[PDB]
Amino acid sequence: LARLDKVEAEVQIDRLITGRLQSLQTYVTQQLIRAAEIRASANLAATKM
C-alpha cells in the first residue's frame, strides 16, 4: 500500500489474501479435528467420573 498503485497493489494483495486465507482455514480445520479428540477424552473423563 505504501509502494504500489491500487490497480496492481490489488494483484499483490490478492496473493497475500489467498495465502493467508488458506493458512487460516488449514489451522481452523486442524483445530476442529483436535476438538473432536479432546471431546472424546472429555466424554471418557465424564464417564470415569
Binding site: 498503485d5 491500487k6 490497480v7 496492481e8
Partner: protein
C-alpha cells in the same frame, strides 16, 4: 451507453486505458478501475491538423 470523444496526440493514445497514468489520464480524462467499455481511436491528421 455514454459515448465520449476527443482528440489527442498519437503518442498519448496509450494513456486512454483503465489504470493508466500521465498528463491525459491524470488531468484530462480518467477511466475507472473497473471500466466496462471499449476505446476506439484512429489517426486524424488529415482531419484535425
Amino acid at each position: 451507453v455514454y459515448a465520449d470523444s476527443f482528440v489527442i496526440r498519437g503518442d498519448e493514445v496509450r494513456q486512454i486505458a483503465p489504470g493508466q497514468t500521465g498528463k491525459i489520464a491524470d488531468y484530462n480524462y480518467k477511466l475507472p478501475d473497473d471500466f466496462t467499455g471499449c476505446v476506439i481511436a484512429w489517426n486524424s491528421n488529415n482531419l484535425d491538423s
